[PDB]
Design a protein around this ligand. Structure first.
Ligand SMILES: CCCCCCCCCCCCCCCCCC(=O)OC[C@H](CO[C@@H]1O[C@H](CO[C@H]2O[C@H](CO)[C@H](O)[C@H](O)[C@H]2O)[C@H](O)[C@H](O)[C@H]1O)OC(=O)CCCCCCCCCCCCCCCCC
Ligand code: CLA
Ligand code: CLA
Ligand code: CLA
Ligand code: CLA
Ligand code: CLA
Ligand code: CLA
Ligand code: CLA
Ligand SMILES: CC1=CCCC(C)(C)[C@H]1/C=C/C(C)=C/C=C/C(C)=C/C=C/C=C(C)/C=C/C=C(C)/C=C/C1=C(C)CCCC1(C)C
Ligand SMILES: CC1=C(C/C=C(\C)CCC[C@H](C)CCC[C@H](C)CCCC(C)C)C(=O)c2ccccc2C1=O
Ligand code: SF4
Ligand code: SF4
Ligand code: SF4
Lengths: 74, 31, 88, 146, 142, 32, 80, 202, 220, 214, 155
């Protein structure tokens, strides 16, 4: 079981990190802002920071507090 | 317990799967 | 001042250092036997491949054939008793 | 283009070894080559899937065939709990008398790898119970991939 | 007017160093510098070590156009002499590099017809779709 | 297993010979 | 060979042309500029890629943008 | 141009120029990266020395029965080790030195102009295919005599009679590699079509 | 202990997305360099101007995700393993007691498991885990090699090859034998790619050996 | 500055030399162990590699307070061929014997000390200008890359060779210690047991650590 | 005086002469070797060069090989056979280096002597001159290991 459960977690990790890479290669090349004007893809690029900034809050919240508790418990 | 005879049959059968790749890989690279 | 631009051979210092002039310093007694022993294999792809195809076959041959194997799982190998784990 | 990276002339002409390194890693990118039309880009892809799809089957026929040949099955089928499933044998020209013996753990004669892959049960819970079944099955995937 | 040939101008006094020509020069191009001097003094050599420039027109052989303008920026900004250099390669013919117009590029002249210009601001470039599978080096070509 | 002499024949061929040929031929193709 | 291309935004400060260690950029006279001067790149051959140009541009967003292409004997700057 | 019936196309490398050519070059070895007709002699010397090979092992089963595989074993002749091989070493090389070093210099017809060995040369060079053709055939049986011992072990003729006695039950297809050959026969039936589909479907 | 871990797991999922969601949205452009649409996809940098751009591209953004991917998966596969170990060994008290503070992870899960693995190559003899005892070392040495590519950047090595291509060139008996393709310190992006390969190949083989040979040594 | 390409080149060869010889001999010892053939691994029972000279040095100094040091009570220190000394049931200092495992380590000390000289010397000689960057001085002591061009100049400066030297310093000295600390516990420290003089680790070094195994 | 100078005049060439470069002894010695001479056939070098490198390479195998214990002298042949492989391997390497660097059509790229004189370029450059050397290396390379064996079981 161990040799399996780890296999499908790692092999699931790489695949998502590739899902986003080709997500970038999309935006870097074959995305067209003209035909997409006002679409749902263009609305996201319209607010980049909100998505970027809030992931930066959640990742810090879990950052300080999760580590902050392990250190306190230590 | 597998009969020694069957073994070479399989290895020869997988030998053909070696040429069909070589024939593919050529035609694909030759494009 | 150096120049002699008419020769770009001497401007590059490219001069062969330790190459000598002297012609063959080797004896004819042993010459005529080797000089005809080297050209038996002169050729590009029909000889080098003999070394790959025919030459490397002693790994194949004496790897399987001759019983000089030392502690090889090939031949001598397991002869002692096999290890069993705790559970099974 | 003559030289190695046949698909791009910017690499095709390089005096250095970077021609070599990128030549390998720029291969599978089909949107960038000399001239890749929309049609012939889909071509190599859909051909390549036949490559991946055939490579997988052989890889499976190997697992089946080895367990059928170098591994124990029947002996495991009888005592699934108290005996270890075996994978391909250990062939190294490099061993002492000890390490050979110490790796012969199993039912077989030679040194072998107790198989932690897990594929070995999914055959039995689908159920087979002969090394013949495994070989019979390991031929199809060889054929089918062909 | 601008171009010149290669007369005999001696070489500055130097005692040898591992910086210098290599087996490029055999099969590949190499450069040549010619400047003049008034007093004799020492100058940094870009290939390493120091060298004594003569009292008059000098000639060097370097391995790179890169190394070459390092020495012009040297003598132009420090000893305040002009320099001009060449491209020499084994087939026997020499080219005149550096102010081909006869004037340093830093200062304006007339007759220069410049290449590689774009009449659009950067934001006005094409986005990579509009060159797709037709192909160009990049959105800046189109 | 009854085939036992095979590994001694293949493994050297596939661990050395093939990597010897595929080392040579793949090289000669880097420069033409 | 690297690509280097120049844009309307030039002030003609020459500060690029002073930077190039291979002396690629060369100032071509022009009209619409305040100083009536525009750079230009006759040699894309010898652009090594230093992008000492792009550092020197006083312009907000650059008047020169070097686009790295493939790399030859010169554009690798080899002494070998 | 019977040419082993692949269908139409043979590679250009084998057009039917050299004698015996059916235009069969699977591996592109019949090309000329160095030469080809060197293979012809290499075939021919193999072929020549092969076709005469059977004769030794053939008739010995029919007469006194020290058959070829057991033949070189039991004799009284060889005298104290090296004399057995050492005599046979020289005489081949000395004349082969001539023909080998000579006829890759003295011209590419291996002992055809026959200056070392003068035949009656009545028929001479036209039918020369037939020689090459009659030996190539004996070449293939020579392989069989191996498997005749390996698979069966009986003499070539002691195998013949068994095939004569029981024609149905003496086949390879029963014994041993029979399971293996019957597959190589099947995969050899489609063989001409794959080779043909290059041309037709392409 | 179950509680505190699921937040680390939850942490790892965000900072992995945060990187990747950034590389996608800034692939088009950002305030620093708003040319990246037309400058390519994977490129080393815009040069040391206007603040010294580095890793400015969207490949270098992805590049950084892997390092977090290997944590948030490492945390999982750890947290899965040592909750189960206690359960396979018949005790729930090794985890939920010592799982809270970070020392038990090191002191209990790592310290006990390592005892069986390192005895494989033991100079007293070969255990049946000597297979994994070696590889567990092969796992580090690759991981440790991976830092040479990630840390040391190119310009140092390019000046070193210069000295060697000078020595081989002017040394005797090697004058005669020369290279067709002039050797050069491999490209910026090429190293990071090579670097992250070693990092992962080493990151996997250690935990692949530790996991297998801990449960093969004890058998739960 | 003028022949610098010779200095750096040779030093660069000395490191690669010691790289395989100093370090690689552990990999042999690591592998030959795991293959179950202890007859091979360099060790005391197996192939003898002993520090002849170092051993031979300790011979003189324990023979020194005879003739080369006529006026003395005894030798300078006890690490030479002297005898053990005790206080509070502890070993003050006993002698130290140099075996094969002691041999193999010093060459790793040598390996690191050379490699970390390569990096600093290269920083000095190429600080001014290197063959690839002729102006380098005018870019200052401390600067990032010059270009992305030329395959990239990343980290070419002479501040950046000190950046790199600190990881080899760190590495060099760190193992200098692990040599010390566990040689000294093995072959010196511990309580005086009277009989046996049992050490802290029980005197396992030359047998214990040959390969990276132990 | 000053012992050390740049090579033969020009200071701006990469190397510079030193006692191990231009001397009475070192100029002669490195030139005496069956390497740099321009006056001997390349076939004759390989049968010289390769002849030596077989003998000295046998030693490590026939002494410190995997199997260093045999009562039939098999410890010695086990090294001879394997030392005969680096004979067979390097022949593949040698010949490979020929089909790469040297084109059958391109002439000899060697340079001309030390001083003023242009003397005929190295007879070994192109594949012809090179391949004659390679087979020559193979001819000698077999001998070196052979005589190494004969010197093991005799002498
Ligand atoms: C799977 C392997 C097979 C099985 C294992 C076999 C052993 C592996 C042996 C290694 C063999 C390959 C070695 C590759 C090294 C070279 C990498 C390189 O310099 O490659 C770098 C290239 C360089 O980038 C390309 O560089 C190109 C260079 O330009 C060239 O291309 C231009 C585009 O047309 C023009 O042609 C121009 O002329 C020419 O210069 C362009 O810039 C392209 O846009 C740009 O993409 O980058 C790329 O494209 C990036 C593509 C790689 C992306 C994948 C990275 C994933 C990281 C691995 C994940 C960790 C895995 C660990 C696994 C552990 C578990 C076991
Ligand atoms: C089915 C899935 C799939 C497919 C079809 C593609 C297809 C593609 N990807 Mg992609 N990718 C995927 C999954 C996939 N990817 C995943 C899962 C990831 C995350 C890891 C990525 C990350 C990724 C990046 C970052 C990039 C691509 C790129 C590309 C394009 C070119 C690929 C290339 O040049 O490779 C050529 C072949 C190679 C480079 C082989 C290199 C070998 C690698 C480094 C692995 C080496 C480690 C090895 C396994 C270790 C062996 C261990 C052993 C020794 C013990 C192509 C369209 C590139 C692209 O389009 O750029 C424009 C690009 O930059 N992809
Ligand atoms: C154990 C090592 C480690 C740690 C702690 C971090 C921590 C962080 N990384 Mg990071 N990273 C690492 C390794 C690490 N990384 C590696 C190896 C890589 C690969 C290159 C990356 C790549 C990477 C990227 C690409 C990104 C991050 C991001 C983040 C942040 C995520 C939010 C978070 O968890 O905040 C938790 C913060 C902490 C736990 C900091 C603890 C410090 C304490 C609380 C304060 C100081 C203590 C004390 C007072 C100091 C006294 C000093 C003395 C002088 C008085 C965070 C700062 C992301 C980010 O920007 O998030 C916004 C992001 O984009 N990192
Ligand atoms: C699933 C496995 C797989 C598949 C289907 C392909 C398929 C292909 N490869 Mg490929 N390749 C692979 C793995 C694979 N590769 C690996 C692991 C490497 C080494 C890292 C390479 C290195 C490689 C090179 C160097 C080249 C190809 C090329 C090609 C194409 C022509 C076939 C060929 O190589 O001849 C075809 C798309 C060639 C090409 O340019 O494609 C047109 C080519 O030149 N491949
Ligand atoms: C000196 C050290 C050493 C060496 C040389 C070997 C050598 C070998 N071991 Mg081994 N082993 C060692 C130490 C060593 N072992 C130790 C210390 C242990 C622990 C006790 C083991 C335990 C062990 C086991 C348990 C097994 C082996 C096996 C093998 C064999 C695998 C060969 C093979 O299939 O190649 C193929 C190798 C690979 C596919 C992996 C390498 C990946 C390549 C290098 C990447 C290149 C990819 C890229 C596309 C380039 C293409 C290359 C081109 C030429 C085609 C080989 C004989 C196996 C065996 O005998 O049967 C298979 C086996 O099962 N070994
Ligand atoms: C990809 C699947 C796969 C893998 C990883 C292996 C792995 C292994 N096989 Mg193997 N094998 C496979 C499929 C596979 N097998 C199949 C389908 C057959 C039926 C013919 C065999 C028959 C076979 C035999 C008879 C023997 C092995 C042996 C071995 C071991 C040593 C390597 C060797 O000699 O291979 C050699 C294998 C072959 C020559 C068969 C062809 C290669 C198969 C089809 C895999 C090809 C996939 C690969 C990606 C092709 C790329 C090649 C090149 C482009 C890089 C090793 C554990 C040896 C062993 O167990 O000794 C310990 C051994 O004696 N194999
Ligand atoms: C599948 C891969 C593979 C295989 C089969 C082998 C096999 C072997 N290795 Mg080896 N090795 C490998 C990978 C492999 N190695 C790798 C990857 C490494 C580096 C990590 C090493 C490093 C290594 C060392 C350092 C040594 C070996 C040795 C040996 C030999 C074992 C000791 C013995 O009995 O020699 C006894 C051998 C004989 C009695 C005769 C062998 C000679 C054969 C029959 C002739 C071969 C003909 C052919 C021309 C060889 C060239 C091949 C090429 C031209 C195609 C054996 C031949 C030992 C050795 O070679 O010493 C002898 C040894 O010291 N190996
Ligand atoms: C464990 C990680 C690791 C390793 C192995 C190395 C290795 C090396 N570094 Mg280093 N480096 C590292 C981390 C590492 N580094 C890190 C983290 C940094 C950041 C600061 C640096 C910074 C750094 C600098 C700044 C310098 C080095 C240098 C060197 C080289 C010294 C010469 C030498 O020892 O070669 C000998 C090789 C070894 C010791 C490796 C052992 C492998 C065995 C013995 C050989 C394998 C046998 C065979 C080939 C197996 C393969 C067969 C297979 C293909 C089938 C060497 C390649 C220096 C250098 O190159 O100049 C000399 C140098 O200047 N590195
Ligand atoms: C960045 C990028 C480039 C350009 C285009 C592209 C779309 C590729 C874009 C996006 C890339 C990627 C990979 C985006 C998203 C990835 C991920 C993490 C997707 C995962 C989504 C998870 C989802 C829905 C889960 C939904 C809810 C579920 C299961 C639970 C349902 C249920 C509950 C909770 C209780 C049980 C019963 C019931 C009702 C079924
Ligand atoms: C060590 C190092 C080098 C030098 C490394 C080089 C030149 C690699 C060459 C080493 C040998 C010659 C090859 C290594 C052997 C591999 C097994 C080859 C793999 C072959 C497959 C890819 C086919 C760099 O060029 C570099 C560049 C940028 C950042 C960091 C570094 C860096 O750390
Ligand atoms: S490019 Fe930037 S710097 Fe060069 S002139 Fe135009 S504005 Fe002044
Ligand atoms: S980058 Fe190209 S253009 Fe910009 S300065 Fe360096 S060389 Fe001149
Ligand atoms: S490292 Fe690469 S990116 Fe960072 S500055 Fe130097 S060049 Fe630009």
């Amino acid at each position: 079981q161990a040799s399996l459960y780890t296999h499908h977690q790692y092999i699931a990790g790489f695949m998502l990190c590739g899902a986003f890479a080709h997500g970038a290669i999309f935006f870097i090349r074959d995305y067209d802002p003209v035909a997409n004007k006002g679409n749902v893809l263009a609305r996201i690029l319209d607010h980049k920071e909100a998505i970027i900034s809030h992931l930066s809050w959640v990742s810090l919240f879990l950052g300080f507090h999760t580590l902050g508790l392990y250190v306190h418990n230590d | 317990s597998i009969s020694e005879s069957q073994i070479f049959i399989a290895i020869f059968l997988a030998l053909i799967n070696g040429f069909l790749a070589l024939r593919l890989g050529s035609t694909l690279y030759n494009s | 001042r150096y120049f002699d631009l008419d020769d770009l051979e001497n401007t590059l210092g490219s001069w062969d250092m330790y190459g000598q002039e002297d012609q063959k310093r080797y004896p004819g007694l042993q010459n005529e036997f080797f000089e005809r022993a080297g050209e038996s294999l002169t050729r590009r792809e029909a000889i080098r491949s003999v070394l790959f195809l025919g030459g490397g076959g002693a790994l194949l041959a004496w790897g399987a054939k001759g019983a000089s194997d030392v502690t090889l799982p090939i031949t001598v190998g397991p002869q002692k008793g096999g290890e069993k784990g705790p559970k099974g | 283009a003559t030289k190695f990276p046949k698909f791009s002339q910017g690499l095709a002409q390089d005096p250095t070894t970077r021609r070599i390194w990128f030549g390998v890693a720029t291969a599978h990118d089909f949107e960038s080559h000399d001239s890749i039309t929309e049609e012939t880009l889909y071509q190599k892809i859909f051909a390549s899937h036949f490559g991946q799809l055939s490579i997988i089957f052989l890889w499976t026929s190997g697992n089946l065939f080895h367990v059928a040949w170098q591994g124990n099955f029947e002996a495991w089928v009888q005592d699934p709990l108290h005996i270890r499933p075996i994978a391909h044998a250990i062939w190294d020209p490099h061993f002492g008398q000890s390490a050979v013996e110490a790796f012969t753990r199993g039912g077989a004669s030679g040194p072998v790898n107790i198989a932690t892959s897990g594929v070995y049960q999914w055959w039995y819970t689908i159920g087979m119970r002969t090394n013949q079944d495994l070989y019979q099955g390991s031929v199809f995937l060889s054929i089918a991939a062909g | 007017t601008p171009p010149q040939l290669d007369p005999n101008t001696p070489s500055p006094i130097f005692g040898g160093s591992t910086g210098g020509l290599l087996r490029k020069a055999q099969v590949e191009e190499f450069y040549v510098i010619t400047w003049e001097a008034k007093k004799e003094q020492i100058f940094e050599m870009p290939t390493g070590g120091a060298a004594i420039m003569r009292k008059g027109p000098n000639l060097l052989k370097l391995a790179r156009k890169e190394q070459c303008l390092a020495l012009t920026t040297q003598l132009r900004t420090k000893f305040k002499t002009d320099a001009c250099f060449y491209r020499v390669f084994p087939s026997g013919e020499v080219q005149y590099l550096h102010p081909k117009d006869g004037v340093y590029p830093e200062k304006v002249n007339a007759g220069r017809e410049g290449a590689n210009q774009n009449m659009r601001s950067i934001g006005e470039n094409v986005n990579p779709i509009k060159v797709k599978f037709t192909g160009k080096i990049g959105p800046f070509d189109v | 297993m009854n085939a036992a002499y095979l590994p001694s024949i293949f493994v050297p061929l596939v661990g050395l010979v093939f990597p010897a040929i595929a080392m040579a031929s793949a090289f000669l193709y880097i420069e033409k | 060979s690297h690509n280097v291309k120049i844009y309307d935004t030039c002030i003609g400060c020459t500060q690029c042309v002073r930077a190039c260690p291979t002396d690629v950029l060369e100032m071509v006279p022009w009209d619409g500029c305040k100083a009536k001067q525009i750079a230009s790149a006759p040699r894309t051959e010898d652009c090594v890629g230093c992008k000492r140009c792009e550092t020197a541009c006083p312009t907000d967003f650059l008047s020169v943008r070097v686009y790295l292409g493939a790399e030859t004997t010169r554009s690798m700057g080899l002494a070998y | 141009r019977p040419m082993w019936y692949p269908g139409a196309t043979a590679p250009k490398h084998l057009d039917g120029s050299m004698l015996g050519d059916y235009g069969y070059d699977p591996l592109d070895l019949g090309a000329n990266p160095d030469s080809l007709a060197w293979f012809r002699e290499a075939e021919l010397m193999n072929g020549r020395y092969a076709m005469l090979g059977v004769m030794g092992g053939a008739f010995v089963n029919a007469f006194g029965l020290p058959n070829w595989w057991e033949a070189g074993a039991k004799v009284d002749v060889p005298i104290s080790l090296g004399v057995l091989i050492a005599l046979e070493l020289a005489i081949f090389a000395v004349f082969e030195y001539k023909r080998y070093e000579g006829f890759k210099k003295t011209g590419e017809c291996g002992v055809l102009s026959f200056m070392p060995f003068d035949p009656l040369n009545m028929r001479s060079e036209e039918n020369k295919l037939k020689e090459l053709k009659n030996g190539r055939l004996a070449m293939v049986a020579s392989v069989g005599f191996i498997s005749q011992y390996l698979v069966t072990g009986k003499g070539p003729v002691d195998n013949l009679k068994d095939h004569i006695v029981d024609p149905l039950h003496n086949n390879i297809y029963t014994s041993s590699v029979g399971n293996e050959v019957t597959v190589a026969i099947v995969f050899a039936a489609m063989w001409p079509m794959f080779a043909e589909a290059k041309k037709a479907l392409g | 202990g179950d509680f505190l871990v699921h937040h680390a797991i939850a942490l790892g999922l965000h900072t992995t997305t945060l990187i990747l969601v950034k590389g996608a949205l800034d692939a088009r452009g950002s305030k620093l360099m708003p040319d990246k649409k037309d400058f390519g996809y994977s490129f080393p940098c815009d040069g040391p101007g206007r603040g010294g751009t580095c890793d400015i591209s969207a490949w270098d953004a992805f590049y950084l995700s892997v390092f977090w991917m290997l944590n948030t998966i490492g945390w999982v596969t750890f947290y899965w393993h040592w909750k189960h170990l206690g359960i396979w060994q018949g005790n729930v008290n090794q985890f939920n007691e010592s799982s809270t503070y970070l020392m038990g992870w090191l002191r209990d899960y790592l310290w006990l498991n390592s005892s069986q693995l390192i005895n494989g190559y033991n100079p007293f003899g070969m255990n049946s885990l000597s297979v994994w005892a070696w590889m567990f070392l092969f796992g580090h040495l690759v991981y440790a090699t991976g830092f040479m590519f990630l840390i040391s950047w190119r310009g140092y090595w390019q000046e070193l090859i210069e000295t060697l291509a000078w020595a081989h060139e002017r040394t005797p008996l090697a004058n005669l034998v020369r290279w067709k393709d002039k050797p050069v310190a491999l490209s910026i992006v090429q190293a990071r790619l090579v670097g992250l390969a070693h990092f992962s190949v080493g990151y996997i083989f250690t935990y692949a050996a530790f996991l297998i040979a801990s449960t093969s040594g004890k058998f739960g | 500055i003028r022949h610098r390409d010779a200095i750096i080149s040779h030093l660069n060869w000395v490191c690669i030399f010691l790289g395989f010889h100093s370090f690689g001999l552990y990999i042999h010892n690591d592998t030959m162990s795991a293959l179950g053939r202890p007859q091979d691994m360099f060790s005391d029972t197996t192939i003898q590699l002993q520090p002849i000279f170092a051993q031979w040095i300790q011979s003189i100094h324990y023979a020194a307070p005879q003739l080369t040091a006529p006026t003395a009570s005894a030798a300078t220190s006890l690490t030479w061929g002297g005898d053990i000394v005790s206080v509070g049931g502890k070993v003050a200092m006993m002698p130290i014997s140099l075996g094969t495992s002691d041999f193999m380590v010093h060459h790793i000390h040598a390996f690191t000390i050379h490699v970390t000289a390569l990096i600093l010397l290269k920083g000095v000689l190429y600080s001014r200008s290197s063959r690839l960057i002729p102006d380098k001085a005018n870019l200052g002591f401390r600067f990032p890359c010059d270009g992305p061009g030329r395959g990239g100049t990343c980290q070419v400066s002479a501040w950046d060779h000190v950046f790199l030297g600190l990881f080899w310093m760190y590495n060099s000295l760190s193992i200098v210690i692990f040599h010390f600390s566990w040689k000294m516990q093995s072959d010196v420290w511990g309580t005086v047991s009277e009989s046996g003089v049992s050490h802290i680790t029980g005197g396992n070094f030359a047998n214990s650590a040959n390969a990276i195994n132990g | 005086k000053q012992v050390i100078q740049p090579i033969n005049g020009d200071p701006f060439i990469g190397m510079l002469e030193t006692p191990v470069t231009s001397a009475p002894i070192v100029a002669g010695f490195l030139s005496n070797l069956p390497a740099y001479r321009t006056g001997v056939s390349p076939l004759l070098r390989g049968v010289e060069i390769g002849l030596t490198h077989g003998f000295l390479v046998a030693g490590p195998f026939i002494k410190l090989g995997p199997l260093r214990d045999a009562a039939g002298g098999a410890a010695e042949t086990a090294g001879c056979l394997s030392g005969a492989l680096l004979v067979i391997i390097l022949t593949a390497c040698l010949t490979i280096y020929g089909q790469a660097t040297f084109e059958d059509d391109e002439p000899q790229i060697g340079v001309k002597t030390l001083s003023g004189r242009d003397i005929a370029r190295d007879p070994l450059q192109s594949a012809e001159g090179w391949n004659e050397f390679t087979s020559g290396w193979l001819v000698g390379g077999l001998s070196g290991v052979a005589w190494a064996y004969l010197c093991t079981q005799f002498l």
